[PDB]
Amino acid sequence: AYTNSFTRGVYYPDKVFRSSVLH
Amino acid sequence: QKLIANQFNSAIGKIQDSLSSTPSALGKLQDVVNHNAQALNTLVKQLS
Amino acid sequence: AYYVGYLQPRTFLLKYNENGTITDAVDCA
Amino acid sequence: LVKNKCVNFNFNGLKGTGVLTESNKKFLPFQQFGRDIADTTDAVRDPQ
Amino acid sequence: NKVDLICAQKFKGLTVLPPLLTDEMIA
């Protein structure tokens, strides 16, 4: 059986706090 | 005289609408600002 | 019912809101 | 913890110099230190 | 009307000097 992963699986790459940016 | 004055007034009044409606009207000055900002941002990101 | 997928080296563009929460991402490739 | 004064500091290994003034901010429980747009650490969390 | 990053850039040695003529003087 197979399925679409859609846009899942994103985690926080580091412990850094970033505010209202694109990284 | 009256017709010329009315034409000038109408054109001057349409200047405001032409500038305000069009977002790309002042692209040259914004391009200067964006070039300065991009150069500074490149200089900053070169520190990484 | 459990689902399994595999990680790969990739570049992602993640958006952080003002609260530091990742609210969206772009898979560049 | 020396607050409101220009000091040298070392938080867990994050070494730096500046003035600490208790920012409000909203750090996620796991987030140790913050960063500005220029990738310079503008906030930290006290490990005590 | 038609035309935090500043502080971040300033903390890396890059600053902006004001023009000699203010907008009011140019007006």
Side-chain angles (χ1 to χ4, degrees), chain A, chain B residues 1 3-13 15-16 18-20 23 25-48, chain C, chain D residues 1-23 25 27-31 33-35 37-38 41-48, chain E:
Chain A
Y2 286 69
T3 198
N4 209 357
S5 74
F6 278 174
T7 63
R8 319 199 57 74
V10 170
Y11 54 93
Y12 287 79
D14 52 9
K15 273 110 168 67
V16 182
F17 168 89
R18 310 175 202 272
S19 211
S20 214
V21 311
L22 318 181
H23 189 250
Chain B
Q1 177 165 331
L3 164 71
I4 289 164
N6 287 342
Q7 277 168 323
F8 167 78
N9 290 342
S10 188
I12 274 283
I15 290 299
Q16 300 222 225
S18 172
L19 291 170
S20 180
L26 287 83
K28 291 210 228 157
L29 312 180
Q30 194 68 58
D31 274 356
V32 173
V33 174
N34 292 350
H35 287 317
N36 154 71
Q38 165 79 76
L40 275 194
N41 159 72
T42 291
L43 197 64
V44 158
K45 85 159 69 94
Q46 283 287 95
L47 281 175
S48 319
Chain C
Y2 65 90
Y3 312 75
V4 172
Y6 283 93
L7 307 182
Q8 276 138 69
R10 279 178 101 81
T11 309
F12 272 46
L13 184 65
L14 320 158
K15 145 154 64 143
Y16 293 74
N17 60 5
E18 86 283 5
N19 291 342
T21 286
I22 295 177
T23 63
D24 208 5
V26 166
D27 182 8
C28 302
Chain D
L1 181 58
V2 174
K3 315 154 286 300
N4 272 299
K5 195 197 189 320
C6 167
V7 318
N8 188 337
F9 58 77
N10 180 333
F11 288 86
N12 269 89
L14 186 76
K15 272 166 64 62
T17 309
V19 170
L20 319 163
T21 54
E22 292 83 35
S23 176
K25 283 221 187 174
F27 275 39
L28 294 181
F30 65 93
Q31 267 160 357
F33 55 94
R35 268 182 185 175
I37 331 178
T41 56
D42 71 339
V44 84
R45 152 177 289 143
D46 193 20
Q48 311 300 331
Chain E
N1 283 351
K2 217 68 158 137
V3 186
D4 192 275
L5 180 78
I6 296 300
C7 328
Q9 293 179 340
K10 163 157 74 123
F11 289 157
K12 323 222 82 63
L14 326 172
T15 40
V16 168
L17 316 167
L20 175 63
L21 285 178
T22 67
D23 288 333
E24 312 95 57
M25 291 169 176
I26 299 176

